[PDB]
Point group: C3
Chain length 341, copies 3
Amino acid sequence: DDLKLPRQRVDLVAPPFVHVHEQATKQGPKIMEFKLVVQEKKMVIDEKGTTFQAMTFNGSMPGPLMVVHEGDYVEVTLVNPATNTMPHNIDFHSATGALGGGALTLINPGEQVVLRWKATRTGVFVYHCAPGGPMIPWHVVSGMNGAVMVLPRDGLNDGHGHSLRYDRIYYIGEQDLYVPRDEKGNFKSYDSPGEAYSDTEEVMRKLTPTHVVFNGKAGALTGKNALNANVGENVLIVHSQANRDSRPHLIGGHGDYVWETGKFSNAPETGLETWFIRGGSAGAALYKFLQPGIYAYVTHNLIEAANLGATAHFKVEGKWNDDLMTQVKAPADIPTGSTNE
Amino acid sequence: DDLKLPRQRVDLVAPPFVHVHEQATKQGPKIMEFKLVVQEKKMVIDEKGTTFQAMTFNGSMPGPLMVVHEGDYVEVTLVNPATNTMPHNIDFHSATGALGGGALTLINPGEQVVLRWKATRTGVFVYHCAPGGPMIPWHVVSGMNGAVMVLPRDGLNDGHGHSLRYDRIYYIGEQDLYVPRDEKGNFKSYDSPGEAYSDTEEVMRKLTPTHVVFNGKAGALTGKNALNANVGENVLIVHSQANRDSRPHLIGGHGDYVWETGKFSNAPETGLETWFIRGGSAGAALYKFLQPGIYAYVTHNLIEAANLGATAHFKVEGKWNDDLMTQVKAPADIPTGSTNE
Amino acid sequence: DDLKLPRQRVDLVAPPFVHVHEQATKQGPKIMEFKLVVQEKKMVIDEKGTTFQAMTFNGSMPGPLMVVHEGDYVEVTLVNPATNTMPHNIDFHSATGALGGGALTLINPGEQVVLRWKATRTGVFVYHCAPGGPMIPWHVVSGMNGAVMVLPRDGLNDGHGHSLRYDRIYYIGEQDLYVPRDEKGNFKSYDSPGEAYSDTEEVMRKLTPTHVVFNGKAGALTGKNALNANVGENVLIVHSQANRDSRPHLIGGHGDYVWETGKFSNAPETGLETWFIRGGSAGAALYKFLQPGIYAYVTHNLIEAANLGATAHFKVEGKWNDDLMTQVKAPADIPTGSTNE
Ligand SMILES: OC[C@H]1O[C@@](CO)(O[C@H]2O[C@H](CO)[C@@H](O)[C@H](O)[C@H]2O)[C@@H](O)[C@@H]1O
Ligand SMILES: OC[C@H]1O[C@@](CO)(O[C@H]2O[C@H](CO)[C@@H](O)[C@H](O)[C@H]2O)[C@@H](O)[C@@H]1O
Ligand SMILES: OC[C@H]1O[C@@](CO)(O[C@H]2O[C@H](CO)[C@@H](O)[C@H](O)[C@H]2O)[C@@H](O)[C@@H]1O
Ligand SMILES: OC[C@H]1O[C@@](CO)(O[C@H]2O[C@H](CO)[C@@H](O)[C@H](O)[C@H]2O)[C@@H](O)[C@@H]1O
Ligand SMILES: OC[C@H]1O[C@@](CO)(O[C@H]2O[C@H](CO)[C@@H](O)[C@H](O)[C@H]2O)[C@@H](O)[C@@H]1O
Ligand SMILES: OC[C@H]1O[C@@](CO)(O[C@H]2O[C@H](CO)[C@@H](O)[C@H](O)[C@H]2O)[C@@H](O)[C@@H]1O
Ligand SMILES: O=N[O-]
Ligand SMILES: O=N[O-]
Ligand SMILES: O=N[O-]
Ligand SMILES: O=N[O-]
Ligand SMILES: O=N[O-]
Ligand SMILES: O=N[O-]
Ligand SMILES: O=N[O-]
Ligand SMILES: O=N[O-]
Ligand SMILES: O=N[O-]
Ligand SMILES: [Cu+2]
Ligand SMILES: [Cu+2]
Ligand SMILES: [Cu+2]
Ligand SMILES: [Cu+2]
Ligand SMILES: [Cu+2]
Ligand SMILES: [Cu+2]
């Protein structure tokens, strides 16, 4: 027992929600204990009911958000149940050495492994499966990726000596999927990930996804699963993309404070319209809602947002501010005396 | 008449030129009145005379640049003449609430609407049509996008307490187009936007444009329509892309001061070779010309620049500086006594 | 002889290595003399032995890294031997005027030219061939690109008044290739660049590379050609991409200090997981190795990294730090008393 710190077990929750944590803490460093269970399963990924052979951490795309503080140790039990068919591992971009932990965590079905890494770098970071060779992109684009957030012990700041505090936090994992089609253009179904592999690899090689989804499927964060907020709330939106670039935009809003490279040692940019998540990274945006109503959160390739699945909704309760925006005259017939050339 | 400020009507001009404005102002806030008229029309988009069914604000791709100051109110009359076939609206990324104004501006052919938004955020911002669902990307990649610039009341600064002033300003709108081809590879023509839609949507789904153009067509800003400048002039180049990333580069020059995320609350970067406009945003670069001659302004995917239409020219008058660059020896035969292995 | 400075001949070396230079210097400005010889040749670009008709500076993809100091003059002899079939030239993104030198350097086979440019802008910059029109992207994606580094005379700094010094420097040139296929999907071979052109241009038009390689071929910087370092060494990694965006990531490491836009007048970002090289630019990352072992350096589009060739290896000698990372429990059977739902 060389490392003599207090241990704290964390129960992970399904995205887009985030397990209970403190922003600022005066506790010393702890060993923060997490468990991730690999689950291979068929999942529905679009509104027409297209299925595909997914591979996940904890049964979700993305994997759950892990939250710790700078100087904590993160002790992860990775479990690969014997119902799975492939070996898996885990690479933390937040970690130092052994390919992020991938070189120490390769487990066959029926095995588990325990990795400990010190959280020396602040920010939001991708984690993902990386077995080796062509298996790396295949496991990642099959759904085996998530994120970890390492907060400064004093919480967030604006990089100019002022504390920032969020009222709410959501984790938006964006997934590029490569679903094979038959000669007529219909999506193909398979009985196992292994059976899907050869056809999937051919789609992956052309670098054009068939679907781009938040929280594992088209429409996942729309309708009844819209994200909730209130006028005046500072909301932190963590956005990850393990394989492909994304350009997040809150329609009707802004990024008040944006860490687009996702690392809290760097001051955020202010008042962004659209920001950029480089493939293989996580970023974070803080926004204080000023108006009630529906907001679409998109990647601002609008073809991807509207036609390949990459739209989420916020439903924001409160009172409308007519000073910021108003309809001066409702839609009306163009006046007869108008010239419009 | 709740809002009791002076009103000022602005006459918009066609890109790449920009309507008359002040950089720094000591006037108080005003209500700045703009009119945009939707025009659906067939347009020529390449040097071989390829046509396509465009949808525009004010008859141009991009729509005109609107320039206001922080704290102004922007009152926009959007007009959809009864010669048009579809409903349209407008979303300002500069605006707060109601999906940027899109939720308050949906008008059928024969209708107009008046929206007012407060310019609380400084920078250059995209505006675009966003009717709903798959219509959003279709109207945007059909040409319905432009930009607005919200200047600080004191004009631009270098983020270190020094004022920056431009001698000239150009607005470069970049458009990704998706033109259907027949089985032989020839571009297809249609008699209406509606007739083009199904085939166009199939091209859009593969996320590879057929054309990438500045100011609405290949070669628009070359030859006689080259952009003019003089040695010693500080030129502001505003660049927008509503749907797809761009990487602007001034061949033979630099970006002296670049806001690549386009927001003047953030200090510019200095001395860039190539900068990055994320899809769904506008950015701005200031350069002081040091040498006369021809400059190509490109997106530095050179396939897009040279083969899909995304090249503009600057013609710069003045005297050559042999200290910065000189031809020491003109092309000559390789000397007989040379070894070149 | 208007310019009366000392002259210094530099001997270039093949990437990923870099010719001998000083970081900080108290010498005054010099005329730094470089020679580049164009070589068209068939080259092997993947591990299955696929060939293609390359065009190179000095026989390598990328061209060699040139290193000078701010205020130096760079005098380049470009040679196009009569064994070559096409005209060539050179454009320096570091240079001011005449399209970066391209307008002053166009040479037929059997000719040479001497260009001098003043190094007024600090950073890493792309250089590339740019003959004119569609020849520009074709020569660049055929391999005619490299980089130049213009150091501040005081060497690198962290943008907050602290000197940064590297123990080692590597230049990673990333190349997107467009190799034609026959109807069965096999790569086509040609006897000359001219014969390859028409088929290659058709692949280039669809903006999807067939290969993405470091140092000219899949696996070039793996196995026996892994990059060497030691625990505790600060290593500068210069990364260029003349045509297409890249997202570099050091697997198991970080970017301690990253200039992603590549320009030393701007403070670096700290502690990045993944950074972004915009097509048509060079960037630089400093990392101090903390753990021994194998590191993969990738573009974090993992399809490109694992399946299209864009992976390099570092082999790092030293002692493992179990405080940063440890395997707490080796792979073992899942305990019988475990519940994993
Ligand atoms: O996309 C090609 C072609 O295939 C069809 C079916 O023949 O539709 C498929 O692809 C669509 C777009 O991805 C999906 O909407 C649908 O689930 C799938 O069957 C054609 O409609 C289409 O032109
Ligand atoms: O800098 C972050 C900041 O943006 C704020 C200003 O305090 O608001 C932006 O939009 C508001 C709209 O009323 C204005 O107060 C302000 O002028 C503008 O930059 C906050 O919401 C937040 O702290
Ligand atoms: O691009 C496919 C194929 O189509 C042809 C005509 O059969 O040319 C078309 O496409 C070209 C590239 O976009 C355009 O230059 C031209 O306007 C269009 O007819 C072939 O030339 C080409 O291989
Ligand atoms: O920082 C902006 C600045 O770049 C300037 C320097 O004042 O010039 C750059 O190129 C010039 C070439 O002669 C040099 O003065 C300077 O050393 C270099 O950084 C201006 O054009 C502008 O203010
Ligand atoms: O990629 C299409 C198709 O072509 C085949 C040969 O028929 O393989 C070629 O393409 C592969 C992927 O690029 C290469 O691995 C190989 O060198 C090349 O022959 C098929 O295997 C493949 O489905
Ligand atoms: O800011 C650059 C800096 O990162 C350093 C800190 O000095 O290390 C990072 O990782 C180390 C792991 O032990 C820690 O010292 C530090 O807390 C963390 O930010 C150096 O390697 C380098 O100077
Ligand atoms: O130690 N107090 O939180
Ligand atoms: O399955 N994803 O939330
Ligand atoms: O572990 N890979 O299939
Ligand atoms: O009020 N003077 O510009
Ligand atoms: O039609 N565009 O300038
Ligand atoms: O309003 N859309 O076609
Ligand atoms: O002049 N001394 O290096
Ligand atoms: O051929 N390239 O190193
Ligand atoms: O010089 N171009 O083939
Ligand atoms: Cu896996
Ligand atoms: Cu990774
Ligand atoms: Cu419209
Ligand atoms: Cu938008
Ligand atoms: Cu060439
Ligand atoms: Cu260039």
